[PDB]
Each structure stands twice: as C-alpha cells, then as structure tokens.
C-alpha cells in the first residue's frame, strides 16, 4: 500500500542493492500486505491470552501491554515478541511492555467525567478527569 513505484524504479532499486552487496548475485523484491502483518501480531497476543490495547496510526500499529503481570505472562510475552520481531522487524508494529503498580496507589476515587481522588477521608483532590 505505502509504496507507489513503477517496475522500472523497482528494477533500478534492485540494481543499486546488488551494487551494495558484492557477494550477492541478485536481489528479489517481494510485496507484502500490512493487514496481514497487523493481523498476525494481534492473533499472536490473543493466542497467548495477554492483556493489551491496540492503537492505529497513519503508518504504524502500537500494542500496549501494561499493568501487574505474572511471571508466566512476562515469560510468554518476551518469547512471542522475540519470535515475531525476527520475522517482520520493528519498522511497522511496536510492542510496549511496562510493569505498573495500582493505578492510583490504593485509594478511593470517582472515575466519571467529574472524577476526583480521596487523599484521605475529608480530603478531595480534583486533579483531572479520571
């Protein structure tokens, strides 16, 4: 999708790569589908039962895996990620893995459009829409 090149241009590109790699006899250019890439990523996370969120941009997809994770989850995650990366590279899909504690450190709050935090009984904080 993202490349609009003519066959002649592709041939020229091929020849220049061949000039950069003096040990290679020829370079074969193959066109792949982005939807396929993104799909295999998301299906792999579901196949591993990991919790995640997905975000889409003009030119990339970010899967954010964050929170309190078990040792088993961390192991499975790092194994899968290392496998996928070796196949597609880090140029289109990114994985962000972050350990988080409790979101608000264990204190009561209202999460509406007018949410707020109870610092202590008798103490309101109103920092931001939660």
């Amino acid at each position: 999708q993202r490349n609009t090149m003519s066959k002649k241009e592709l041939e020229v590109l091929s020849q220049k790569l061949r000039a950069l790699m003096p040990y290679a006899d020829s370079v074969n250019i193959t066109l792949m589908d982005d939807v396929t890439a993104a799909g295999q990523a998301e299906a792999g996370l579901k196949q591993q039962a990991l919790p995640y969120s997905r975000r889409n941009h003009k030119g990339g997809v970010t899967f954010v895996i964050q929170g309190a994770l078990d040792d088993v989850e961390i192991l499975r995650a790092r194994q899968f990620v290392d496998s996928y990366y070796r196949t597609w590279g880090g140029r289109y899909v990114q994985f962000a893995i972050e350990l988080k504690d409790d979101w608000l450190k264990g204190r009561s709050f209202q999460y509406g459009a007018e949410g707020y935090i109870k610092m202590s009984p008798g103490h309101w904080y109103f920092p931001s829409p939660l």
Partner: protein, 75 residues
Amino acid sequence: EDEDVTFNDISSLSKHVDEGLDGYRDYLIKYSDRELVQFFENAQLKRQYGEETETVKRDKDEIEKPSIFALLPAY
C-alpha cells in the same frame, strides 16, 4: 455589671454570656501547650461524632475556641 442595654432574647443572651468568658479563654490558651490542647480536643470529637471522624492534625493551627472542659486539664 454593665448597665447598658445589651440583650433581648435567648440567642442574644447565650451569646452575651459566652462572649463574657473570652477574657479567660484567652488566658488558658496563652499558657497551655498546643500539643495537649490538640489531644484533648480530638479525643472529645471522637467521643461525640465517632472515631471514624477525620483526625484533625491541626499542625498549623487556629484552635477554634476550644471547649473549656477540654482546655482546662491541658493547662
């Protein structure tokens, strides 16, 4: 003793009597230890309104005319 007309009705009388004692509350407060005054005040709030009522920790304080029964043993 002051003979000038000053009160008319129950709320004005109770305020007139209360106002007459501030000359002595100011004395007790000026020599009592702030920490003890705070202890005896909090421990009365937790009797009346229940111990779950927020412990005040008035660490920077204007102690809001504390009750004399709480103020006297601190002195």
